[PDB]
Amino acid sequence: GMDYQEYQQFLARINTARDACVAKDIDVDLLMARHDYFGRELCKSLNIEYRNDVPFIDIILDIRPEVDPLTIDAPHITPDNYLYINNVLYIIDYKVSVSNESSVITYDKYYELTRDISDRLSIPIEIVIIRIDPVSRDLHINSDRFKELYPTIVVDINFNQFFDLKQLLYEKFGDDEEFLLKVA
Ligand SMILES: O=C(O)/C(O)=C/C(=O)C1(Cc2ccc(Cl)cc2)CCN(Cc2ccccc2)CC1
Ligand SMILES: [Mn+2]
Ligand SMILES: [Mn+2]
């Protein structure tokens, strides 16, 4: 799980919180903490360097350092990570959700915006959304091409801290109508 230190910060914030706006910022900070936690552990399993929200321009500069970043016609996306093997660019994104609705929105965005640049660099760009179901703890990965490189991937983590902290937050603001009907 997260460091004792990070769990303490959430515990302190949840207990000090008197107001729905503060409460929702914790709710959102937990989802993001959980996403980043899966990110770090996933990157250990894949044995690739851990990254977050990498500017696409930097990814291009890394795999093709001759490219002038002032002129290249590149999309403005910040994918969580990426892998370049056998002249194939895998654009990786971490997801922690029980559904694919977010996965699809990200895949649709990243797929559409990377068709042009793939054609220009003559490098096939494979969009890999690596999602863990936080309940079942099962890995769902869309890209068949990516799953050939990494045929069996055990992460073996859990989100019981995240579930507890969230539950404590919904317990505390359970009769705050404004908290229960506020969005990210
Ligand atoms: O949902 C994800 O899996 C994910 O990684 C998203 C993000 O990283 C952004 C921040 C974020 C939001 C929510 C979560 Cl759970 C984790 C991170 C939101 C979309 N991003 C929008 C954006 C795109 C391009 C340029 C600026 C901002 C900002 C970062
Ligand atoms: Mn991201
Ligand atoms: Mn992500």
Curated annotation (Swiss-Prot):
Source organism superkingdom: Viruses
Segment forming the signal sequence: none
Result for mutant: residue 93 to A: Complete loss of nuclease activity
Annotated phenotype, changing residue 95 to A: Complete loss of nuclease activity
Phenotype when changing residue 80 to A: Complete loss of nuclease activity
Binding site for Mn(2+) 1: 35, 80, 93-94
Ranges where the record places region Endonuclease: 2-184
Bilayer-crossing regions: none
Subcellular location, record wording: Host Golgi apparatus; Host endoplasmic reticulum; Host endoplasmic reticulum-Golgi intermediate compartment; Virion
Chain sites annotated for binding Mn(2+) 2: 53, 80
Cited function: RNA-dependent RNA polymerase, which is responsible for the replication and transcription of the viral RNA genome using antigenomic RNA as an intermediate. During transcription, synthesizes subgenomic RNAs and assures their capping by a cap-snatching mechanism, which involves the endonuclease activity cleaving the host capped pre-mRNAs. These short capped RNAs are then used as primers for viral transcription. The 3'-end of subgenomic mRNAs molecules are not polyadenylated. During replication, the polymerase binds the 5' and 3' vRNA extremities at distinct sites.
Subunit structure: Homomultimer. Interacts with the glycoprotein N; this interaction allows efficient polymerase packaging into virus particles. Interacts with nucleoprotein N.
Similarity remark: Belongs to the Bunyavirales RNA polymerase family.
Note: Classified as His(+) endonuclease since it has a histidine upstream of the active site that coordinates the first cation.
Note on domains (UniProt): The N-terminus contains the endonuclease activity (endoN). The central region contains the RdRp activity. The C-terminus contains the cap-binding region.
Protein name: RNA-directed RNA polymerase L
Origin species: Bunyavirus La Crosse
